[PDB]
């Protein structure tokens, strides 16, 4: 709506802040192994995926556009990251075999986006 602060400053300065948060969200660890292999109606999707995900992604996709100047703005990046998270959060329970390998990425990147100033204000 209005009164926000997710532009930070420049698209390139964002590629930088995106790097550190890339190390967090994308630490090449087991926590980030299943994130790039989510579920979708095109392949063994799950019941009702338009209210809990609508447009899911794979950590490898947002990464193919992250290193480039495609999703340097936290608005677009945080949009896919957050959705890519909600894609595996709105129905991953709180302690089952789905809300865990991604909960470490949500807690480690949510701390790297503030630095990215997407959460600046």
């Amino acid at each position: 709506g209005s009164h926000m602060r997710k532009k930070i400053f420049k698209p390139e300065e964002l590629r930088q802040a995106l790097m550190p948060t890339l190390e967090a969200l994308y630490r090449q660890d087991p926590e980030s192994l299943p994130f790039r292999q989510p579920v979708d109606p095109q392949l063994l999707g799950i019941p009702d995926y338009f209210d809990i995900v609508k447009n899911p992604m794979d950590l490898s996709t947002i990464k193919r556009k992250l290193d480039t100047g495609q999703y340097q703005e936290p608005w677009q990046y945080v949009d896919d990251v957050w959705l890519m998270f909600n894609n595996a959060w709105l129905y991953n329970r709180k302690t089952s075999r789905v809300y865990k390998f991604c909960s470490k990425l949500a807690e480690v990147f949510e701390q790297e986006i503030d630095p990215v100033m997407q959460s600046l204000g």
């Binding site: 579920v39 063994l44 129905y91 991953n92 329970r93 089952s96 789905v98």
Partner: peptide, 20 residues
């Protein structure tokens, strides 16, 4: 039975990827 008999769809308890 030989042919289907009032079957229709069946949720069969399916909770997304938190089980399969």
């Amino acid at each position: 039975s030989h042919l289907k008999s009032k079957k229709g769809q069946s949720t069969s308890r399916h909770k997304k990827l938190m089980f399969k």
